[PDB]
Amino acid sequence: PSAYGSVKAYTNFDAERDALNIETAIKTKGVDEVTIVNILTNRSNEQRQDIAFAYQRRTKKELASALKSALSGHLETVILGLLKTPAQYDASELKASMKGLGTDEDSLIEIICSRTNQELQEINRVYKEMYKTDLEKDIISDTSGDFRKLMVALAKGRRAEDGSVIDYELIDQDARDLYDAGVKRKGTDVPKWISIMTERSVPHLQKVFDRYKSYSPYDMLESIRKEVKGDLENAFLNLVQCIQNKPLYFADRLYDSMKGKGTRDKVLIRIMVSRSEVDMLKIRSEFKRKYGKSLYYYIQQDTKGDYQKALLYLCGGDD
Ligand SMILES: [Ca+2]
Ligand SMILES: [Ca+2]
Ligand SMILES: [Ca+2]
Ligand SMILES: [Ca+2]
Ligand SMILES: [Ca+2]
């Protein structure tokens, strides 16, 4: 399990009954949107799985397929998202970010840099089973240059696992290499960075990055913005953020999605769904710490409707 996320497993749970009340809410005219939301966002994900089981074995029509028709707009996006299992959701968002070589580079980057070894493996599996083709191929297909190399590497999900002894020598050797390969040099040995940052264990890389500051006048992030540019730079930046502080990373991503004119709902929804039973609690705390007001608050301000309520239940608290 994971004790660090909002939207905990609903106690008292009755799958059979819930599926009834959802039908009811659908069967109603205008849809009791309100109920559907009030239910599905206060149930854990597996709980939703046996509700879709129960709703199919009680009507002979698949719940997701039913709600697609029952709903519209960003609310649909949300709920439809929640019904998928974690791996399926990730897989689907991934595929949809590549639908054409007019790819949505940003969304790809996010899911890849943030997702862990286990998560990644399960995704690769589900992706192949879902779309009859390898995720690695689809990545290669829609990316180019160094960027491709990076994303592939990352998506293999073969990060060295958390070695339980601390390699103080290596940490130094790596930091050095990153410096030598980047800032110290004219131009940049990109494949080194890709190598070190993809392969090493995360708690190793955290320490590498803090050591790096002993050789370089700019921290790892600043070094990235200087030494490289483009979609590669964007990736590196995201990656580093995920290693140093992932809750914070997601917090910032959430902020950017609302701060300005209108809203980047595609991102906001994805994050709220995906991280609801993972690190949402840590995210909210980091967010509040940095931005002064709650996440709840920005979400409240930037979105409205039944939809807004869904998002709040997913945030799951006021802070
Ligand atoms: Ca209505
Ligand atoms: Ca629809
Ligand atoms: Ca594009
Ligand atoms: Ca340089
Ligand atoms: Ca806004």
Q: Which of the ligands is closest to the CA of residue 193? A: 4
Residue 296 Cα, ligand 3 centroid: separation in angstroms? 31
- In angstroms, the CA 242 to CA 135 distance is 21
Asked how this structure was determined, the answer is: X-ray
Residue 231 Cα, ligand 3 centroid: separation in angstroms? 10
Residue 66 Cα, ligand 1 centroid: separation in angstroms? 16
Write the burial class of residue 150 (CB in 10 Å: 0-12 exposed, 13-18 middle, 19+ buried): buried
- In angstroms, the CA 236 to CA 134 distance is 24
CA distances from 120 to 7, 111, 271 (A): 23, 9, 16
Neighbours of 119 (CB within 10 A): 17
Q: Which of the ligands is closest to the CA of residue 299? A: 5
Q: Which of the ligands is closest to the CA of residue 28? A: 1
Q: Which residue has the tokens 């609903």?
A: 10
Q: Which of the ligands is closest to the CA of residue 229? A: 4
- In angstroms, the CA 85 to CA 64 distance is 12
Residue 71 Cα, ligand 1 centroid: separation in angstroms? 10
The torsion angles phi and psi of 143, rounded to 5 degrees, stand at -130, 165
Residue 215 Cα, ligand 4 centroid: separation in angstroms? 14
Residue 169 Cα, ligand 4 centroid: separation in angstroms? 25
Contact 61/25 with Cβ under 8 angstroms? no
- In angstroms, the CA 33 to CA 116 distance is 35
| 267's tokens | 């991102």
- In angstroms, the CA 182 to CA 192 distance is 9
* Residue of 200, 291, 292 whose CA lies nearest to 252: 291
- In angstroms, the CA 241 to CA 201 distance is 15
89 CB-side CA count, 13 A = 25
Under the phi-then-psi rule, with left for phi > 0, alpha for psi from -120 to 50, and beta for the rest, what region is 30? left
Using only C-alpha atoms, what is the Rg of the chain? Answer: 21
| 152's tokens | 């592939």
Q: After which residues is the chain broken (C to N over 2.5 A)?
A: none
CA distances from 178 to 195, 199, 221, 224 (A): 10, 14, 12, 10
- In angstroms, the CA 63 to CA 285 distance is 34
Residue 235 Cα, ligand 3 centroid: separation in angstroms? 14
Q: Which of the ligands is closest to the CA of residue 73? A: 2
Residue 317 Cα, ligand 5 centroid: separation in angstroms? 21
- In angstroms, the CA 87 to CA 1 distance is 15
The residues, ordered by sequence, that sit 6+ positions from 246 with a Cβ below 8 Å of its Cβ are 114, 279
The residues, ordered by sequence, that sit 6+ positions from 19 with a Cβ below 8 Å of its Cβ are 51, 54, 55, 58, 63
Residues that place a CB less than 5 A from ion ligand 5: 258, 263, 302
| 304's tokens | 């409205």
Q: Which of the ligands is closest to the CA of residue 255? A: 5
Residue 185 Cα, ligand 4 centroid: separation in angstroms? 4
Cα 271 to chain centroid distance, Å, stands at 5
Q: Which of the ligands is closest to the CA of residue 101? A: 3
Residue 306 Cα, ligand 2 centroid: separation in angstroms? 15
Contact 271/314 with Cβ under 8 angstroms? no
Q: What is the 3-state secondary structure (H, E, C) of the chain?
A: CCCCCCCCCCCCCCHHHHHHHHHHHHHCCCCCHHHHHHHHCCCCHHHHHHHHHHHHCCCCCCHHHHHHHHCCHHHHHHHHHHHCCHHHHHHHHHHHCCCCCCCCHHHHHHHHHHCCHHHHHHHHHHHHHHHCCCHHHHHHHHCCHHHHHHHHHHHCCCCCCCCCCCCHHHHHHHHHHHHHHCCCCCCCCHHHHHHHHHHCCHHHHHHHHHHHCCCCCCCHHHHHHHHCCHHHHHHHHHHHHHHHCHHHHHHHHHHHCCCCCCCCHHHHHHHHHHCCCCCHHHHHHHHHHHHCCCHHHHHHHHCCCHHHHHHHHHHCCCC
- In angstroms, the CA 64 to CA 4 distance is 28
Contact 88/111 with Cβ under 8 angstroms? no
Residue 177 Cα, ligand 4 centroid: separation in angstroms? 13
Residue 189 Cα, ligand 4 centroid: separation in angstroms? 9
- In angstroms, the CA 216 to CA 183 distance is 8
Question: CA-based angle 64:66:67, to the nearest 5?
Answer: 70
Contact 83/52 with Cβ under 8 angstroms? yes
Q: Which of the ligands is closest to the CA of residue 186? A: 4
Write the burial class of residue 207 (CB in 10 Å: 0-12 exposed, 13-18 middle, 19+ buried): buried
Q: Which of the ligands is closest to the CA of residue 75? A: 2
Neighbours of 3 (CB within 10 A): 6
- In angstroms, the CA 37 to CA 160 distance is 40
Domains of the chain as residue ranges with CATH: 1-84 (1.10.220.10), 85-163 (1.10.220.10), 165-244 (1.10.220.10), 246-319 (1.10.220.10)
Under the phi-then-psi rule, with left for phi > 0, alpha for psi from -120 to 50, and beta for the rest, what region is 157? left
